[PDB]
Every structure is written in structure tokens, then in C-alpha cells.
């Protein structure tokens, strides 16, 4: 069975749990020492020291979704493609 770590799910805990029960996957509410197949974090990718498996957080997405970084990327693309990127 697929092992999922939900110790750092936070607001995504409950919505995950039923889903975990919908797939008949077996959970670690408090985590474990051995590597897990899927790790579910809530805020930061650096919540746990993961060396293998899957994690629900790409690195650094806390900073990218910040307004100034997204704005900088959007203006870069608008310089590259003004007509296409007019939604912002």
C-alpha cells in the first residue's frame, strides 16, 4: 500500500484524510523514521528533511507566489510578449 505522510498537512489534513480513505491508502499522522512514498506538507518544502519519495511542495514556491516576484516575471514576459500577456 502507498504510504502518505500527513504530519504537516495543516489545513489540508481532513480533506486529504478522506481522500486517503477513498484510495485505501494507509497513513502516517505522526510520521516515521523510514522513507515514505508521499510527503504532504502545508506551507514550506523545507518542513521535513526528505531524501526520497514524493513531496507536495516544490522548493521555494512561497517566494515565487509573492506579489513582487510574480509581477517581475509578468513584466518580463510582457516585454517578451505584450499582446499575449495582457491579462495582467
Amino acid at each position: 500500500p502507498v504510504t502518505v505522510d500527513s504530519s504537516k498537512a495543516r489545513t489540508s489534513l481532513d480533506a486529504l484524510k478522506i481522500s486517503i480513505r477513498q484510495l485505501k491508502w494507509k497513513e502516517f499522522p505522526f510520521g516515521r523514521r523510514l522513507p515514505c512514498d508521499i510527503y504532504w506538507h502545508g506551507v514550506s518544502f523545507h518542513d521535513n528533511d526528505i531524501f526520497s519519495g514524493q513531496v507536495n511542495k516544490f522548493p521555494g514556491m512561497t517566494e515565487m507566489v509573492r506579489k513582487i516576484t510574480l509581477s517581475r516575471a509578468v513584466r518580463t514576459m510582457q516585454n517578451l510578449f505584450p499582446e499575449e500577456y495582457n491579462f495582467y
Binding site: 502507498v2 480533506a15 491508502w25 508521499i38 514524493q54 512561497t62 495582467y88
Partner: protein
């Protein structure tokens, strides 16, 4: 996304950590629980192995 009267979308904020809390709210549960279930189904670690075994067989 803000949907303009002339049906032109406007991208406002983007969130790396959206609120997945379902509390109970029927709409929030129906959307979010299904979203996470589909997310987990799309990346079952044994799906690739099962597909490879089926292709080999």
C-alpha cells in the same frame, strides 16, 4: 481570476498554499476532497510499474 463583463479574465493573486480546509461546508468538501483525490490518483507510485508490466505482458 476576476471575470470581466466582456468575458476577459484578469489574474489577481496566486497562492502557493491555498486554504484546503473543508470546514462542514458541502461545496468546499465536494471541491477540495475531489481535488486531492485526483491529485493522489495521478501520482500513485505503482501506476508506472503497473503500466510497464502491462506493456511487457
Amino acid at each position: 481570476i476576476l471575470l470581466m463583463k466582456n468575458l476577459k479574465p484578469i489574474l489577481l493573486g496566486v497562492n502557493a498554499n491555498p486554504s484546503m480546509r473543508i470546514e462542514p461546508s458541502l461545496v468546499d468538501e465536494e471541491v477540495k476532497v475531489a481535488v486531492i483525490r485526483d491529485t493522489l490518483r495521478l501520482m500513485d507510485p505503482l501506476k508506472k510499474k503497473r503500466e510497464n508490466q502491462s506493456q511487457q505482458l
